[PDB]
Amino acid sequence: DRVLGRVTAEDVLKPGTADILVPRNTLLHEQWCDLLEENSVDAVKVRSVVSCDTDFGVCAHCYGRDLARGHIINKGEAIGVIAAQSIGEPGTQLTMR
Amino acid sequence: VTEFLKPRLVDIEQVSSTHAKVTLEPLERGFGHTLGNALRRILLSSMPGCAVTEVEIDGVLHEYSTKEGVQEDILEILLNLKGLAVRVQGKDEVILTLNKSGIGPVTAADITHDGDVEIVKPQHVICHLTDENASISMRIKVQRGRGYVPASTRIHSEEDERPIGRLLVDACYSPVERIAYNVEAARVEQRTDLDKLVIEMETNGTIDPEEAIRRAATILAEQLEAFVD
Amino acid sequence: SVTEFLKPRLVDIEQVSSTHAKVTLEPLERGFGHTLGNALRRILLSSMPGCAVTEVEIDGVLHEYSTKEGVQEDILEILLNLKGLAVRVQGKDEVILTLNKSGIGPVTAADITHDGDVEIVKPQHVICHLTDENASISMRIKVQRGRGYVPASTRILVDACYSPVERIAYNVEAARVEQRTDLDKLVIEMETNGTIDPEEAIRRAATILAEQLEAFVDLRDVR
Amino acid sequence: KPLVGTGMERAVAVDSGVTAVAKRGGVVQYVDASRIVIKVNEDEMYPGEAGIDIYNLTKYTRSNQNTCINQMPCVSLGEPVERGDVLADGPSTDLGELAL
Amino acid sequence: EIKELLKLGDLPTSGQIRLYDGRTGEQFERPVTVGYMYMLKLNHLVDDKMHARSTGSYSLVTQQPLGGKAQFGGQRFGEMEVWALEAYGAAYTLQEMLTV
Amino acid sequence: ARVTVQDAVEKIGNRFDLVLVAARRARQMQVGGKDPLVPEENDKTTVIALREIEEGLINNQILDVRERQEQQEQ
Amino acid sequence: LPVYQGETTQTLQDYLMWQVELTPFTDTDRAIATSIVDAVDDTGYLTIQIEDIVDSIGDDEIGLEEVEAVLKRIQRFDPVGVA
């Protein structure tokens, strides 16, 4: 699930030499996860924030959905407001060690 | 249908003046439970009753004060009087007068009695006085109804009416307040075993059980008439 | 007021199929709708008259663990198919029926002979699975007269679905007439096995209740 | 009155000073909805005084919480009452026990 | 001890009693323990919490509505609320709040 | 009442511009000037506009095309 | 300090203005109504004269008939007999 809502790059390769499993800009929507579990691949290169050369916000091509939408995030949405709020939502932490 | 054998009424038992038990002829399977439940709900839901609506007293004006010579307050008097049970003839909206002086206990017996008003408990307590010179003078407005009605509901009925000195009360119009039914199979040998249903009720004594169950039957017939079409 | 009560006039009925229908009511007096729905449901569930087969006498061993001998299907599945039949009899009492089909395989209701008062709503129902060769089979069944339902474990051998019902559901919703919103709106949904209009069955059950309750009042409301 | 108790309710009610108790009284003469007079016996009586103890109840008074406080009588008439016995019942009280 | 108490009361020691539906008139399985609770009503009553406003007088300073029910006041919004709204991103609603 | 909005979602896609299109169409309907193309079933203009755009008859260009069609007609 | 009166009583001038806004009137009619509302005494009477109001309007198109119509509309208000 850590990579389920992520889009990989061209670095994905099959265990067999000169073999691939999925093209560069692809979303791990629902089924390729089973295939990669079959191949037992562990190291996956995925584009993320800040690494996205945009100079303003983040390009939508490295975020996925992470929402109630089964589709990729649309343009104009404010992730920053969505973020920094979910993190502090579990106000059930522990103090005094 | 195949020989439904609709039952009849039989063995009307008067356990007490306010509590009694009624039994019915045996019927077919799976019907005593539903019949008992429906009849109980009908009786407990909508059954005509007579109660007090308003009482006027010359002495005190509002319910939150008292009168010299009594031990209890006006609110307790109201609570006692809404506990009264009384039956009236066909004419409704009847007002009666209560007047007495002295120190003795005050009950329902020593009240102005008319031919259309019948007291079931002349033993109820009306907050006996404590002073010999103390005298009571109030009139009680009594009507008939079917369901519980608070005084807030009857506010709209009087805007120009209701001068100071007359105090409304809440009407429940519930004469039974408790009932129970039981079903069992017996009294049939020539045919298949059949269940018989017995109803047990306690009332205020204002109404009679046969009349109440007849009214329940008539009203359930009245509803069920409409759904045929 | 003293004894007046609202009478439903919204008798609109919408049906999805010829066997399934949904019925809604207008706002009605307090508490009655739930009692009424429960009562009618229990009546139509308990004892509805109708014709049904009590047992089948097929060729072979009377035990349940019967073989296929070409039918490639256990007799339990056969009788499960059999139990879902809406057979009608106008005036005949319990009568015997049987089937005999060539070995084509689709064992349908047409395999049964046609009697004077024996009729089926649907002749396309499958009786038995697809056979494998040209063999034939006999049914030797009998339809009966009675009401409601009873498993044949008590009264022998398959079942007795004398009540022509499939599924019934009732719901109650709040409503208002003019000012007060303490009104009962009744929702009725009926599924019938067949041969009878669900509204016609509703009317039949209502008449059954009325004739089960009319003498309680001892001839009231004469005029 | 609560049916399950802890016993301390009686002490709470009496020490609350919200109801009326009997101090050096012998017998009640007259009872009113708000007025209470008790005749003390000569045993607990010292000369130079009439020998009657009057008590006036609190009837429907607004509290600091805007609530209503009212004290209800307990005894009926002509009842020999001992010293330290409760006489009236205020709000949320019943027979000397805090009944809330 | 309470078991023998219930014994003298002609009651089952288990405390579970069968009940019948008041609506369907059907016996319930798993008989239910019942209780008589010395229950008490609190000061937090709905008629006091009853409050609403459409449009009333406003403040001389900042021209804002009154507030906490002080002579038909109006409820106050918060920054964390508009953070949540911005996460929803309904800008027109925000402008409506800020202007209308 | 339109219990949920889904048809217009794939009719538009971005989940945002559909709001503006519905707003402008409903404004034009409330101010009047055009008899609604979709049959009316005793519902408010918002749900009717949602149903119409669900039908796939109204988008961000046909309204504007009719805008020019009327403007040139003056 | 933190405690302020914060009172915005209409004083029936704001009520009259709201009634004018809530009423349908032409721009000239609205301006005439506002001018009439300006010249209202506390007792509820018009301080200025109808001819004075017309002169203050300073419009050739403005006529005594329009003033009478506005006054009737002004009369058509709560309380009756306004100004």
Place this chain on the structure above:
Amino acid sequence: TRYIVNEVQDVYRLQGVKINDKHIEVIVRQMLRKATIVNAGSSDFLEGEQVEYSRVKIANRELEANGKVGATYSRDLLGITKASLATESFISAASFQETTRVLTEAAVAGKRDELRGLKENVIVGRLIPAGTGYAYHQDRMRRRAAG
């Protein structure tokens, strides 16, 4: 990034709370800006230049005209309580921690807001460049580019 993600995820998993990391590296990207430099690179002989502006300047300066003028930089992380005050808009980051010092600094600088920040739209009372208002703000920005 991976270290902090692992640490915070262990902290949350010990209780059992599951949260998508994408928020975490969102916070990290917010945490990563204001890159100081050692080489001037014909841009500025100062410190504390944001990563976005420096990257834009070097992209539009090296490839475009002169690739020889390069400014070697180091990206320094500044704490949340610290990086929050590092905003180009004086309107923002004022309610965050302090106003008086921020107000004095802005008055000394004589800078402007441009109403780019969402808080600027909030205080002004206009549609934010996000969600429904994103399209309107994009149209407004395109119009202002033309005029």
Place this chain on the structure above:
Amino acid sequence: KAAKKMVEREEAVVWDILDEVIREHPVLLNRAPTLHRLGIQAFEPVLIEGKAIQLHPLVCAAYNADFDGDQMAVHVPLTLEAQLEARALMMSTNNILSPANGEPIIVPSQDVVLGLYYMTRDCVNAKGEGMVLTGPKEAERLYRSGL
């Protein structure tokens, strides 16, 4: 003024037109303390003669309410676009999954769960163990007798 007088007099026709107006009009609710975006939801208002609102129990988990002494606020959208944003974005029918990790927010945990567990069980065998049917008759037999 006539409208105000009629409204203050609370006529039945006033109630009728109020019901007509409220029919196709959304409304939103908001828990005062909320730690996530989902503390605010939109619902269809329905009139019930009382003094307190009835929040659907399944949404209470998101609202983090527990049916004790609690207070609620109500906000009415006026502009058409506000209502459109309400029905497309504030609406409970759209907010099912958690935006934090992705789990479905609406998850019953109360009496529904135990009732589901109880209805689907078997001590050893109840009345009518060996019975075989089609499945619609299951309720038929359970309600009446035999099963």
